[PDB]
Amino acid sequence: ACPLMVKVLDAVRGSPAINVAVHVFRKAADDTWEPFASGKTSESGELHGLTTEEEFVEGIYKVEIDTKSYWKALGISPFHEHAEVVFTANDSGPRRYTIAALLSPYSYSTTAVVTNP
Amino acid sequence: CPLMVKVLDAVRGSPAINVAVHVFRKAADDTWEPFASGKTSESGELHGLTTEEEFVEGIYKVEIDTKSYWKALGISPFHEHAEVVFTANDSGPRRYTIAALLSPYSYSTTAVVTN
Amino acid sequence: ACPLMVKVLDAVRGSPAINVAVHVFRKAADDTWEPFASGKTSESGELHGLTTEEEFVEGIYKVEIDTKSYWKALGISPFHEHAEVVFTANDSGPRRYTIAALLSPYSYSTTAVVTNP
Amino acid sequence: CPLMVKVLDAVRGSPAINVAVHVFRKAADDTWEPFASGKTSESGELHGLTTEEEFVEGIYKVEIDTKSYWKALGISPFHEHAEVVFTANDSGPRRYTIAALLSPYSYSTTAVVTN
Ligand SMILES: O=C1C[C@@H](c2ccc(O)cc2)Oc2cc(O)cc(O)c21
Ligand SMILES: O=C1C[C@@H](c2ccc(O)cc2)Oc2cc(O)cc(O)c21
Ligand SMILES: [Ca+2]
Ligand SMILES: [Ca+2]
């Protein structure tokens, strides 16, 4: 019953991207981004436990993935500052969201898998 | 031009036409000051955003209005938009092409930077 | 200890791609593709149990994913006949391979995550 | 031309230059008969593979020699190559651009088909 999971993979090494910082924000009624949760990717490149079913109410959310630090630490100066995912959540009732990102120094892809528990 | 944006549609196998694109420059106060905008052409390209003089070093944001594009096609989208944030010109002036490949629940962006 | 897993996701629906046929082949000493394993993706879009550590000897392998049937069944005539992954395996000792594919009607991406148990 | 192939490098943020590409047509016996080939240009493009007359309906294979490209750059690659298999012209003649974005452990291909 974790309703939000983020998973990050490295397209160069063919590996999970470990220790990647992730910050999650929620758009406020006044229209600004309130901090909602944060964490770092595990060995498996996954970040669990960000939120709960109750807390994770309808809204617009932003997941910012600190790809730049991940590359810089490997000696690489990447193109992007970060990878950002912005989406409306739970608009038709609660769902479970997996936000997956695949990283290369000059490219990233992002895909959402959304399921109905 | 020093900056071009090009958008493709993975569902139809075509350029993504009439997609709104906004470009911003990060301000001293860490706000985004809007800088240039346009809509992609019938080839999915947006040219003429900026000039070599104007396009000085800094951190830039390209915001692509993916949601409106999908809505227009009658297809439900996941993302609000697709954003590309990058530092420009850090080693000199370059020509940047920002390319995006769009699916309703996924997108991929790549930069082709040539000097 | 499953050394080969294939995972397929649908970029249109934001879902696993279920019931996707997958065929695996191994290049023979005579240079032709011998059938090695086959299966279909589960509800979670994953296919496990293709092979074993002992069977999965060094070689060149091909994973063919029947994307066309997956789309056609949804009413869609897709661009690709299939998605094929060809790779050398276990060249430096045994590894565990996850072959992931993300599908759209006119595009697919494939990524390998390779780990050392 | 009715068929173009374009290859980009996600590691360097550049066109992938001097990449070998082979094109095949499926034969009656379900073998691949090699049809056209080339190497990508400094812009990552390969033009001139075929002509409208020659490019009749059928099933075609495009094989991109990704492995050699990475080897040349000194980077270890996962794939032997990247293949694109598709049926051409089923609704009429079209112009096909096959685009590939390459990373050492990943690739993505997309078709832009215009009539
Ligand atoms: O290995 C991958 C690659 C990743 C991915 C592919 C494409 C994309 O656009 C974004 C992420 O997809 C995945 C999604 C998963 O749930 C688990 C995975 O192991 C993987
Ligand atoms: O930079 C890119 C990436 C590429 C692409 C992205 C995703 C994918 O899955 C396959 C190809 O598309 C392009 C197509 C072009 O005409 C010019 C380009 O610069 C690009
Ligand atoms: Ca400059
Ligand atoms: Ca024809």
Ligand nearest to the Cα of B56, by number: 3
Q: How far apart are CA A38 and CA A47, in angstroms?
A: 9
Q: How far apart are CA C95 and CA D62, in angstroms?
A: 29
Q: Which two tokens stand for residue D17?
A: 């230059």
The angle formed by the CA atoms of residues A91, A94 and A96, to the nearest 5 degrees, is: 110
What Rg, from alpha-carbon coordinates, does chain D have? Answer: 14
Residue B73, SS3? Answer: helix
A79 contacts A106 by C-beta, under 8 angstroms: yes
| CB-based contact B11 C104, cutoff 8 Å | yes
B14 contacts B8 by C-beta, under 8 angstroms: yes
Q: Which two tokens stand for residue D100?
A: 């590939």
- Nearest one of B41, D105, B17, B108 to A11, comparing CA atoms: D105
Task: Tell me which method was used to determine the 3D structure.
Answer: X-ray
C65 contacts C24 by C-beta, under 8 angstroms: no
Q: Which two tokens stand for residue D24?
A: 């095949």
Give C64 to chain A, closest Cα distance, Å.
20
**Nearest-CA residue of chain D relative to C82?**
D85
| Tokens 């912005």 -> residue | A86
Q: How far away, in angstroms, is C44 Cα from ligand 1 center? A: 13
A115 contacts A95 by C-beta, under 8 angstroms: yes
Q: Which atom of ligand 1 is nearest to the CA of D106?
A: 3
Specify the CATH superfamily of domain D1-115: Transthyretin/hydroxyisourate hydrolase domain (2.60.40.180)
Q: Which two tokens stand for residue B50?
A: 């900026």
Helix (H) or strand (E) holding A30: none
Torsion of CA C72, C5, A5, A3, to 10 degrees: 60
Which residues in B26-63 are b (16+ Cβ under 10 Å) and which e? beeeeebeebbebebeeebbbeebbeeeebeeebbbbb
Beta carbons within 8 Å of D40's beta carbon, 6+ residues apart: D5, D6, D7, D15, D16, D17, D18, D19, D21, D46
- Ligand 2 pocket residue status of D99, Cβ below 6 Å: yes
What resolution in angstroms does the PDB record give? 1.6
Pairing assessment for the beta strands D32-39 and D82-88 based on DSSP bridges = unpaired
Specify the CATH superfamily of domain C1-117: Transthyretin/hydroxyisourate hydrolase domain (2.60.40.180)
Q: Is B70 exposed, middle or buried (0-12, 13-18, 19+ CB in 10 A)?
A: buried
CB neighbourhood size of D53 (10 A): 7
Q: How far apart are CA B54 and CA B51, in angstroms?
A: 5
Q: How far apart are CA A26 and CA D88, in angstroms?
A: 46
Question: Could you list which residues have their CB under 5 Å from ion ligand 4?
Answer: D 57, 89, 93
Q: How many CB pairs lie under 8 A apart between chains B and D? A: 32
B61 carries a ligand binding annotation? no
Distances (CA, A) of A31 to A27, A50, B63, C92: 6, 22, 17, 53
Of D78, D84, D90, the CB nearest to C112: D78
Q: How far apart are CA D49 and CA C82, in angstroms?
A: 22
The ranges assigned to domains in chain B are 1-115
Q: Which two tokens stand for residue A100?
A: 């997956």
